[PDB]
Ligand binder design. Structure first.
Ligand SMILES: CC(=O)CC(=O)SCCNC(=O)CCNC(=O)[C@H](O)C(C)(C)COP(=O)(O)OP(=O)(O)OC[C@H]1O[C@@H](n2cnc3c(N)ncnc32)[C@H](O)[C@@H]1OP(=O)(O)O
Ligand SMILES: CC(=O)CC(=O)SCCNC(=O)CCNC(=O)[C@H](O)C(C)(C)COP(=O)(O)OP(=O)(O)OC[C@H]1O[C@@H](n2cnc3c(N)ncnc32)[C@H](O)[C@@H]1OP(=O)(O)O
Ligand SMILES: CC(=O)CC(=O)SCCNC(=O)CCNC(=O)[C@H](O)C(C)(C)COP(=O)(O)OP(=O)(O)OC[C@H]1O[C@@H](n2cnc3c(N)ncnc32)[C@H](O)[C@@H]1OP(=O)(O)O
Lengths: 260, 260, 260, 257, 257, 257
């Protein structure tokens, strides 16, 4: 059952192509410190680069929890908010990020959940925002992007009233993808991933970047461009342009197929 | 049961922190004239300023109706369309606006419903657009913003076919938040409001402005900025900047915590 | 049962105000070649102009299929991708375009389905994207616009896992408008259309352009502008502006009603 | 020569179709207060309604000054934003006539107005970061869509002062004239606008807002779209059939492609 | 020197990779009609398909004129918009060669084209609000994203005429040359473009549109993305496995971060 | 005079609040590599954290050069984009000090930085379409929001070189000075910024990004919004009530309209 790489507050493991970032703080119910986030960013950064991995999954250690948010009940000392760096990271990574929620995903923990491409929910799961009850709020991806899933009314609902939502309430609003019994959530998530690795990783990275460019204006278009520049690089045409530079002569795009 | 402030075609009342704007034209089934809208704008403007109120609710007088739209079956005389001024107002107000629909919310009446942050629906409620049957249309918030709740297909549906939608059909598409029996709709709405007043009014005003900035481009960002400028005003740093102006000397932002 | 206009791979028919574009390639399960698309574009272009038609419907020949996508199992010879020209066309046409799916709507076939204003689904229908399984993807309207119906999570789902979705799964996510037994799908769609032709065609063209301007930034606003310029043209004010040009004298917008 | 309806902290005037809103606080370099803004909101709203008003001009009292922001010396929350928002929902063109210092929330007002005519002694710039505020709304984003991001980021970061000619070359102001001719020119501009159709004008205005204000600017464009729709015979007959309790017949009205 | 395929109201020519669309109605100052636009839509679509065409130029017949809008003298609905839309979905650079009056829907056409080379006798401006129309689409919003909102609001509100140098300083045109050298320069521009890669060009073009056209401009960017994807070995093998009725093996193809 | 923490392919320095990132590869005209970019990402991230750093300057080693893109001579995927993205999420103003050739992905870097101060010998332009790449992200769209679409489409299509004064008139650079005074001026700019409040600065920076970066730029604006919220007494008391296991009392804290 999956290998492992050295971390203090998180777990970074691997199963047959899947990378698994796990929040390993069940005592505090998987709440993150600045160090925790910094470890997650590092873990994802390595997951992005490793050619062996095709799909990433984010989850909590045991049952009962996925993530809680902050706490203080950081290191540096400096009031960091690197939580937001991670938010951006998982959705620029040209690999699907799946949230395997197996309990409470509340506050900051839920925002990490919504920013993940897909969500596998255990029947045990409870979703919600706690910000305005705990003197906080995620007004970025936690608000705008949430509306882009559930509809404005529901997003307005979960932030204002701050209620809890069971797996079925989450499924019924479209927040989560499937709900499976707690025992089966370690499976199913793998079945999902196994289903992705059948498909072209390059087609998936474009579609991910296309979905980001839908919402993130000119920051999302950057990702689309970078994947384009990457594919364009691999074309015989581009080779000619950089060969002519090393050959100090003029480029000859004379005989190359021009598509209407 | 709630106090009151002087109005001719609407009712402006108050219950334990809640302000209640009521369309008082049940004879014409709560349709608005230019005067009605002008009263509603005034009522909301006062609701925005009054430090005693935390949540606003919009509703119709008795049962059977929430709102119908226009009529002519205005004052000035001048063909006003101030209906749109109100639309903008309720969503710049740093207080949640809840639509307590207790019957027909059709035509212009439904657009007022959708622009309200949350919607409490009585089982009695019927929703729809009548524009293209009555030689009209709301192509602004009535179209674009509607899609941002129900999905484009459903928004396209309700405008083209102009069908009626019962409380459950409304709930199933995500248009409304909850459906409660007609007898209980005066409650529940209060329970909702009572639940908001537990949370930080400042966190809520930012989240509201964040949800507007999601859709309203640079007009929504203005609201976000204004709330920022408001909170920045309250910080010791800002005080120093305006003190130095009244003291005619140079500002000293030397010893103030700089966050990464 | 409906007349007809000359085409090789598609059918262009007419019923009491409804135009019916039919993909006539059931042998290949209604997959399109470049010629097929070019015929569809022509058909729609004629449907746009013909004052007799009020609503357009897109569908496949027999049962079992709506559309499959590409194939090669074009003419010119030139690798065309005119599929995208059609995508833009049906949503600039000032007439509702209804997708009458009576079977498989997969791959490119589903994208044509989602771009259609409304969708009438037969119980027989199966929806899905096959791109990353067949070395392709629609990262434009197939990704972004899809999220604007079903929510990001579901759009992310159907592209990454590439699963099939039955009529009810489609209805439950909001992708399709209604589901009716296969026998009744030729009706119902007509009932829908008959319901549109009761309403003002001009109010509908604005609302369509308003829904496009919601998502398509400055390309959608063009459509809104063009409909505006069209209605403004019909006003006595505009007449005066162009009369003064033909009369070589100065325009007199002196006595014309100015609305606040 | 100019007809008046008075206030306490502003001046409100009419001249041959032109309505002129004037800040009347030169001693404090024409700075606004909560109250001064409230008066402007009112005067603009009245100008919105007046059928004889076709163009609105915002100006300072004498020379030397136009607007130097909000002074705070007279819990203060911020209705300048409502005014900015208002003065671009007015279906009437509004021209900024700057004849001195236009700084802080005084400059953002200049920016928000459709066009700016500047007397040669004009001074443009921000104070925000030095005085304990900022205009992160139209003061920042919208300024970039006039001046360009590189230059818009400049004015906010350095808070320097810019003379009339510098404003012209970056693109902040439309025109620059001598101080003596600035009461004129503006009237010429107004005279030139008033001979074009107010409806086409109000639409283009909405089209410019919709380009940037997203869905809120769309409401403006659509709002003026439905007004034109009201005036058509296929619209009124839709409303008449409802009044007469019968099915509407749009059937015989010219279609368009 | 220039090879021709003819029409009734336009001229369509080829020269060493350069295709030239020319309005052929100088008597009415090169104004378009429904028919004239239809011809341009066709000629552009043919230019879209021609593998030997790398750059497109839009110009007027002689000097004096380029385009003065739609005359209406020959129910008229408005296909100019389809043409505007078309001439920015062409994966080929299109340069406006203006040698006289470019006004009304004639100026918006100039605006829509990627670049504008101007002969020194060029005159730019709008007529809309005076003649009973407006271009609230690319005529308004897109013009602001070239000229800046302050100046874009100017040209529509006042409907004044602007000489070549004024257009240059606000940023409307790329370059200004003497009338004699305007047939040249444009060819030089074309010659310069034709030596760069057409694929990188078509992408940047789509990136510029996507920046402003929202989701529609995204379709363009993505559309060119999937074309490049078609030409890769991991794409064709995906399509081949479908044809051969077996499971696709993308497994051994280089990954990227 | 300047204090150093070293790397292999860059230089990283501090001077009275100013941190200076310098590409240290003049032999290849200051071109970056995957590694050189990684170093810059690190150095910027360190500058992000340093409480004593208020302004960041990006520059080339000597004169003649600033950045000429990515050379590729030393599967290469493209972390320059991460750096571009990073250097606009830094709540600190970053100024491009260009003293030579700024071309290709070297020019886009210049563009991404908030402001550009240019030595008179500066040369700006793109190489993409000729060398087998393009910057369809901030290189294209964002460049238009500085220069204007007409001119932004020019630089990419023709790939010409532009001197310092030409960059100034189109609006690419903020200021132009003699080469000798470019180490100065930049420091003056920095000195001028460092006397304004860092919080108002970081907000305006986020407001400028949010204007263009859509929902991602919104995250930045909101992120700085919640930081200010943390420092308020009604926020901490919300967090304290959670720690103390009791119901929060926001009830007695001043409200705003
Ligand atoms: C900048 C930042 O850092 C903040 C952010 O922006 S992110 C948003 C902040 N979010 C929050 O504070 C969420 C509040 N937490 C909750 O609501 C939790 O669900 C809650 C404690 C009720 C836990 O629910 P639960 O299942 O009933 O667990 P419960 O029985 O209450 O408590 C178990 C332990 O979890 C800890 N815990 C759970 N969530 C926590 C959190 N977010 N912070 C700190 N501790 C937390 C509790 O303190 C408790 O620890 P102890 O045994 O030492 O007292
Ligand atoms: C610019 C503008 O002003 C217009 C706009 O943009 S807003 C859009 C305009 N909307 C409309 O016109 C909606 C049309 N109204 C409806 O469909 C109503 O539901 C409708 C009259 C059927 C009422 O439904 P109902 O429950 O069956 O009530 P019903 O039995 O029909 O009639 C009861 C009374 O309500 C009145 N009424 C209801 N809605 C009305 C409306 N919108 N305008 C005028 N009168 C209305 C009816 O005229 C009737 O009055 P009388 O007794 O004097 O004849
Ligand atoms: C640029 C482009 O052109 C491509 C694009 O961008 S659009 C996206 C491309 N999409 C696809 O390729 C979709 C793949 N097709 C499918 O998945 C089909 O549903 C699929 C063949 C399984 C058909 O499902 P089905 O109901 O079981 O039909 P099935 O029994 O498998 O086969 C029946 C016939 O349909 C044909 N067919 C169905 N879809 C086809 C397609 N997309 N292309 C070619 N042939 C297709 C099969 O080849 C078969 O023909 P034969 O009898 O000559 O072998």
């Amino acid at each position: 059952w999956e290998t492992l790489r050295e971390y203090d507050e998180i777990k970074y493991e691997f199963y047959e192509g899947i990378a698994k970032v796990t929040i390993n703080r069940p005592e505090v119910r998987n709440a993150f410190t600045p160090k925790t986030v910094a470890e997650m960013i590092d873990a994802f950064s390595r997951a992005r680069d490793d050619q062996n991995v095709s799909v990433i999954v984010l989850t909590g250690e045991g049952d009962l929890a996925f993530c809680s948010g902050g706490d203080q009940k950081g290191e540096d000392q400096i009031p960091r908010l690197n939580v937001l760096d991670l938010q951006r990271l998982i959705r620029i990574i040209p690999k699907p990020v799946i949230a395997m929620v197996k309990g409470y995903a509340v506050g900051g923990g839920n925002v990490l959940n919504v920013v993940c491409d897909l969500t596998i929910a255990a029947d045990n799961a409870i979703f919600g925002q706690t910000g305005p009850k705990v003197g906080s709020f995620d007004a970025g991806y936690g608000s705008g992007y949430l509306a882009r899933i559930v509809g404005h009314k529901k997003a307005r609902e979960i932030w204002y009233l701050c209620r809890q939502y069971n797996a079925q309430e989450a499924l019924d609003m479209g927040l989560v993808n499937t709900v499976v019994p707690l025992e089966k959530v370690e499976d199913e998530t793998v079945q999902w991933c196994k289903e992705i690795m059948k498909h072209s990783p390059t087609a998936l990275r474009f579609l991910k970047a296309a979905m980001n460019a839908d919402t993130d204006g000119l920051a999302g278009l950057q990702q689309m461009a970078g994947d384009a520049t990457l594919l364009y690089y691999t074309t015989d045409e581009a080779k000619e342009g950089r060969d002519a530079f090393k050959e100090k002569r003029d480029p000859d795009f004379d005989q190359f197929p021009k598509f209407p």
